Amino acid sequence: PQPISRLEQCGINANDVKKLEEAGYHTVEAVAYAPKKELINIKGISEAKADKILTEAAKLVPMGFTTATEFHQRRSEIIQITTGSKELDKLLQGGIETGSITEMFGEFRTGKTQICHTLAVTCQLPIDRGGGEGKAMYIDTEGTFRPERLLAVAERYGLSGSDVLDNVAYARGFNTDHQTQLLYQAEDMMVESRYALLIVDSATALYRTDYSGRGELSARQMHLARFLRMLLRLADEFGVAVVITNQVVAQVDGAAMFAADPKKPIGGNIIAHASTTRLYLRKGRGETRICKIYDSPCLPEAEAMFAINADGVGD
Amino acid sequence: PQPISRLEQCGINANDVKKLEEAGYHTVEAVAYAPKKELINIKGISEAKADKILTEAAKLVPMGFTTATEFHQRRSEIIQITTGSKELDKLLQGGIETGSITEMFGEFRTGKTQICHTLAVTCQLPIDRGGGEGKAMYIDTEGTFRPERLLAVAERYGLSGSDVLDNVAYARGFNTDHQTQLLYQAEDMMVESRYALLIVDSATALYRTDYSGRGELSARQMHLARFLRMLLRLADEFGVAVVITNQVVAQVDGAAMFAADPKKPIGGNIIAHASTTRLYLRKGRGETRICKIYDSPCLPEAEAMFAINADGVGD
Amino acid sequence: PQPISRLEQCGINANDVKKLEEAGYHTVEAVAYAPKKELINIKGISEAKADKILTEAAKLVPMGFTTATEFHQRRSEIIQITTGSKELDKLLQGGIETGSITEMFGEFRTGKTQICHTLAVTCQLPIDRGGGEGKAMYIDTEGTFRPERLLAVAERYGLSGSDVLDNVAYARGFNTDHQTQLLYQAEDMMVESRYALLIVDSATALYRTDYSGRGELSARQMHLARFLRMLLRLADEFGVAVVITNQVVAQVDGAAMFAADPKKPIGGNIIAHASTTRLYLRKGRGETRICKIYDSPCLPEAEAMFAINADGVGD
Numbered sequence: 022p023q024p025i026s027r028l029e030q031c032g033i034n035a036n037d038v039k040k041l042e043e044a045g046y047h048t049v050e051a052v053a054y055a056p057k058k059e060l061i062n063i064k065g066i067s068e069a070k071a072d073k074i075l076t077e078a079a080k081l082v083p084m085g086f087t088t089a090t091e092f093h094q095r096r097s098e099i100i101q102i103t104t105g106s107k108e109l110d111k112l113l114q115g116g117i118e119t120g121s122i123t124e125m126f127g128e129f130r131t132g133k134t135q136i137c138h139t140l141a142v143t144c145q146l147p148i149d150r151g152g153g154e155g156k157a158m159y160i161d162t163e164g165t166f167r168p169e170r171l172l173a174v175a176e177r178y179g180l181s182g183s184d185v186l187d188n189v190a191y192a193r194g195f196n197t198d199h200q201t202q203l204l205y206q207a208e209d210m211m212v213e214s215r216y217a218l219l220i221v222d223s224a225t226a227l228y229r230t231d232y233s234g235r236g237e238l239s240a241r242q243m244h245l246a247r248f249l250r251m252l253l254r255l256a257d258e259f260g261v262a263v264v265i266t267n268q269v270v271a272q273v274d275g276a277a278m279f280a281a282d283p284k285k286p287i288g289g290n291i292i293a294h295a296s297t298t299r300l301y302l303r304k305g306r307g308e309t310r311i312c313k314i315y316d317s318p319c320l321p322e323a324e325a326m327f328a329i330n331a332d333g334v335g336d
Numbered sequence: 337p338q339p340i341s342r343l344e345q346c347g348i349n350a351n352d353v354k355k356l357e358e359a360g361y362h363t364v365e366a367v368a369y370a371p372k373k374e375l376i377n378i379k380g381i382s383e384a385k386a387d388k389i390l391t392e393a394a395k396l397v398p399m400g401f402t403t404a405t406e407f408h409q410r411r412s413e414i415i416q417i418t419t420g421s422k423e424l425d426k427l428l429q430g431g432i433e434t435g436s437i438t439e440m441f442g443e444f445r446t447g448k449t450q451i452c453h454t455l456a457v458t459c460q461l462p463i464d465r466g467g468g469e470g471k472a473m474y475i476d477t478e479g480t481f482r483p484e485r486l487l488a489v490a491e492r493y494g495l496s497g498s499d500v501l502d503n504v505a506y507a508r509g510f511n512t513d514h515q516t517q518l519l520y521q522a523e524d525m526m527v528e529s530r531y532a533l534l535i536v537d538s539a540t541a542l543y544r545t546d547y548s549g550r551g552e553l554s555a556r557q558m559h560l561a562r563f564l565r566m567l568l569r570l571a572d573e574f575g576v577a578v579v580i581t582n583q584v585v586a587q588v589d590g591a592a593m594f595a596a597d598p599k600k601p602i603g604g605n606i607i608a609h610a611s612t613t614r615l616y617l618r619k620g621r622g623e624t625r626i627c628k629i630y631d632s633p634c635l636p637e638a639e640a641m642f643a644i645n646a647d648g649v650g651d
Numbered sequence: 652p653q654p655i656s657r658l659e660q661c662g663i664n665a666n667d668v669k670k671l672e673e674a675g676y677h678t679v680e681a682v683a684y685a686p687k688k689e690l691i692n693i694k695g696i697s698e699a700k701a702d703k704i705l706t707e708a709a710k711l712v713p714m715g716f717t718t719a720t721e722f723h724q725r726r727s728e729i730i731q732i733t734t735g736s737k738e739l740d741k742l743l744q745g746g747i748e749t750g751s752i753t754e755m756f757g758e759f760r761t762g763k764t765q766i767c768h769t770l771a772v773t774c775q776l777p778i779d780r781g782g783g784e785g786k787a788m789y790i791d792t793e794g795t796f797r798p799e800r801l802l803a804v805a806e807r808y809g810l811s812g813s814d815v816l817d818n819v820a821y822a823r824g825f826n827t828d829h830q831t832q833l834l835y836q837a838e839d840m841m842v843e844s845r846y847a848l849l850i851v852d853s854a855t856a857l858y859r860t861d862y863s864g865r866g867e868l869s870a871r872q873m874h875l876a877r878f879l880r881m882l883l884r885l886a887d888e889f890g891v892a893v894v895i896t897n898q899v900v901a902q903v904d905g906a907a908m909f910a911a912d913p914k915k916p917i918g919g920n921i922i923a924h925a926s927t928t929r930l931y932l933r934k935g936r937g938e939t940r941i942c943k944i945y946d947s948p949c950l951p952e953a954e955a956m957f958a959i960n961a962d963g964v965g966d
């Protein structure tokens with residue numbers, strides 16, 4: 022929310038800052054906690070100019086250091102965007118913490134791309150439905166983008182079909198490095214239009230298909246982190262959910278029941294703690310979908326069943 | 337799609353052609369669908385004019401953000417290949433939606449290699465009906481391709497037998513490396529004509545015999561992921577509905593997990609998270625075969641009674 | 652095929668073929684239809700050299716995409732050796748078609764071993780008469796082989812009877828591995844002398860005793876998969892009708908009120924799809940016996956009153 026428009030004073034030359042901001046650093050906040058090396062990584066950036074920013078942005082930093090009392094203020098404004106139905110919001114303190122990247126984990130049939138569809142409708146509306154009064158960023162690295170589902174959940178919600186369709190900006194991602202730069206492109210529009218979702222689907226999948234072999238798997242984590250830490254940066258720039266969805270490893274050397282690791286974290290590296298919530302979306306009986314949060318800072322763990330009704334999540 | 341000859345705008349090197357086509361990439365959109373990592377790995381190609389490859393091919397495709405309304409504007413020409421019967425057409429919401437990848441199960445006598453024949457011959461039909469355009473590439477990796485069935489379903493749909501055979505261009509796969517390279521070259525064989533259907537019959541069949549099991553499993557699923565990723569690239573690359581005929585492992589009951597556990601998708605989670613739709617072609621009396629919809633982001637669970645006869649998948 | 656004649660040229664060094672001949676590729680089609688992992692373990696010139704060997708084989712065999720018309724033309728020359736009873740000739744539209752596995756299962760006294768003996772006799776007949784003008788490889792693994800039956804069918808078809816037994820080759824599999832070894836030598840046998848019938852009597856009968864027990868030997872279905880893979884390779888290379896036979900296991904399942912007897916062809920999904928057809932013989936009434944049709948890409952369910960007489964199979 023703080024572009025170069027705020028940081029362009031007291032001798033901040035204009036020529037260097039457009040180039041500095043062009044590489045996804047459009048928000049000056051990124052420059053505020055930017056590595057000194059990164060501050061100079063972009064070509065055309067003057068070194069003396071980078072040293073000047075080292076103090077200008079630093080004094081611009083809104084929260085260089087704070088106490089734990091203001092953490093209550095930083096948490097009370099979270100609207101807890103409602104997951105949906107009844108129990109899916111009843112057991113947990115609140116649907117989705119604004120800024121909580123979270124994580125999805127299920128096999129097929131579960132509907133990882135349907136809870137994300139009902140959440141998409143539950144952002145464009147006011148606090149009357151616990152929405153975020155903003156649009157969505159549909160980062161579907163799959164081909165399962167079904168805004169027909171978004172209109173179907175828009176029918177039972179009873180708002181509209183025009184803006185509920187228009188607002189979500191789909192991010193068709195074929196590459197890993199083109200999804201990372203697309204989300205930089207989104208980082209170059211969240212300044213003007215207020216967002217709260219960044220609904221991400223199977224982000225890890227492209228990394229798995231591309232970064233394949235044995236050693237290249239460390240590069241898979243390296244680039245999974247280049248994406249992930251930037252997701253943390255943005256999701257702290259506003260109160261943006263940035264919900265994530267992951268696939269199944271299915272440990273093979275694992276067996277012995279409750280110890281066979283049926284759904285092994287496809288992202289057990291860096292995301293092991295980065296992912297705020299770890300709902301275990303699992304097919305049950307008929308249309309029930311039980312889930313348990315392995316990691317969820319302000320919750321030990323629970324069990325949560327939700328059905329994929331004709332119009333999205335429903336209990 | 338865009339011909340690779342069109343990529344000569346910014347003085348693109350003369351012999352960049354063959355070194356680009358070495359990894360398929362027979363279209364401009366093909367490299368537009370591949371990350372910088374592939375191009376770097378490609379020997380001979382080295383680097384273009386200041387990473388032109390990456391900076392370009394974004395200008396000629398909206399690989400950024402559009403709108404679901406625009407997506408709905410393009411989501412009315414999504415051909416739904418008729419099933420041959422009408423009940424499955426009803427369950428399928430028109431048929432086989434394009435820009436995805438279908439899949440089926442059912443072993444012994446269940447009817448997967450005949451629906452893929454009646455589907456190709458009815459995909460050769462014109463745009464106005466459920467046909468759209470045909471000339472499907474039928475990847476036979478088990479040798480089950482009888483063109484007599486094509487003639488059987490040609491009269492059922494008033495199609496010119498000779499023309500029907502001329503349209504469909506089927507091949508024979510032998511091993512996994514032949515499975516993958518066949519479509520890497522099918523890129524080129526599609527770039528000059530109009531195709532709409534890409535049945536990979538008996539998919540994940542070769543992987544079962546080649547890759548033994550424990551101790552070679554990593555390679556199997558990692559080679560399966562490469563296949564699915566490349567196939568998705570093709571589907572997004574020429575807009576072709578891709579049908580998959582998967583086998584089944586009916587031994588999850590090996591641990592007597594629960595009653596009625598005598599079947600399981602053989603591919604594994606890697607393919608499970610790939611296929612958009614997931615059918616299930618169980619067999620009953622005569623030709624009354626139940627087709628369930630394990631996983632389909634558009635259509636809910638349902639069961640119809642498609643009955644292949646002397647004239648194709650009828651009733 | 653081509654006996655590595657052209658492969659032993661085009662710069663290709665003999666140092667390659669001498670080592671590759673120690674695994675069982677007595678032709679070039681085996682090398683062409685072999686994954687990198689397969690020929691990378693030759694321990695002889697297995698490297699980029701073997702990659703060039705693969706490319707050489709590819710440019711020495713017809714292997715690429717083609718229109719359906721070519722296959723349609725190459726389906727009017729298939730032998731379709733006559734069974735001996737004109738009922739199963741009407742049922743199979745000519746007889747046992749050459750080129751793919753034709754598993755025929757059942758139980759004791761149904762007539763499988765007798766059908767194989769007759770087929771083995773009829774293969775030598777002139778093609779226009781209904782035979783194949785070839786040879787046979789009875790790979791009997793029970794001990795059932797009685798040349799007296801070949802004698803008896805010889806005068807049925809008015810043959811000399813001497814060459815009836817001089818042409819039919821016979822082996823004896825005493826263990827599971829011995830079947831694979833027999834096929835490995837069989838490849839060479841085809842390489843010199845034409846073969847049109849590769850009967851493996853009770854192929855899934857040694858597995859029932861050697862590879863016995865769930866978990867005791869879960870590698871029963873892996874080895875069976877490799878065995879059937881070898882069968883596909885041989886059938887594809889020399890167009891041999893690999894007429895496998897099978898045993899049966901009763902449905903001890905509580906639902907034993909079912910009809911068709913508690914019949915469940917031994918060998919699970921692994922052996923049920925490599926087979927194109929699946930004739931299910933049952934004891935009808937004395938000499939006259941019923942022959943149903945299971946699975947089958949082409950050929951719907953139908954039966955045949957084949958009678959096993961002293962002359963062989965007839966009416």
Ligand SMILES: Nc1ncnc2c1ncn2[C@@H]1O[C@H](COP(=O)(O)OP(=O)(O)NP(=O)(O)O)[C@@H](O)[C@H]1O
Pocket residue numbers: 127128129130131132133134135163165170173329330331332333608609610611612629630631632633634635636637
């Ligand atoms: N329009 C709909 N109405 C009702 N139920 C639906 C509808 N669309 C999908 N479903 C159900 O919800 C499920 C959604 O699965 P989906 O979200 O596609 O699978 P996933 O586990 O998220 N992974 P993938 O299939 O790889 O995208 C389906 O399998 C159906 O059971």
Ligand SMILES: Nc1ncnc2c1ncn2[C@@H]1O[C@H](COP(=O)(O)OP(=O)(O)NP(=O)(O)O)[C@@H](O)[C@H]1O
Pocket residue numbers: 758759760761762763764765766793795853959960961962
């Ligand atoms: N010379 C003959 N004349 C007439 N009928 C015969 C003659 N020899 C055998 N038969 C009949 O045909 C049957 C031949 O056995 P067959 O049914 O082919 O065994 P199988 O069940 O295939 N062998 P296996 O299952 O491996 O023990 C006999 O059981 C008799 O009913």
Ligand SMILES: Nc1ncnc2c1ncn2[C@@H]1O[C@H](COP(=O)(O)OP(=O)(O)NP(=O)(O)O)[C@@H](O)[C@H]1O
Pocket residue numbers: 442443444445446447448449450451480644645646647923924925926945946947948949950951952
């Ligand atoms: N010409 C035909 N006319 C009518 N029905 C047929 C015809 N040919 C085969 N069938 C039926 O279709 C069934 C299934 O054939 P197919 O399409 O090969 O099944 P599948 O389950 O795909 N086979 P597999 O791939 O070996 O598991 C057969 O078992 C017959 O019941």
Ligand SMILES: [Mg+2]
Pocket residue numbers: 129130131132133134135
């Ligand atoms: Mg789902």
Ligand SMILES: [Mg+2]
Pocket residue numbers: 447448449450451452453454
């Ligand atoms: Mg089919």
Ligand SMILES: [Mg+2]
Pocket residue numbers: 762763764765766767768769
């Ligand atoms: Mg016999």
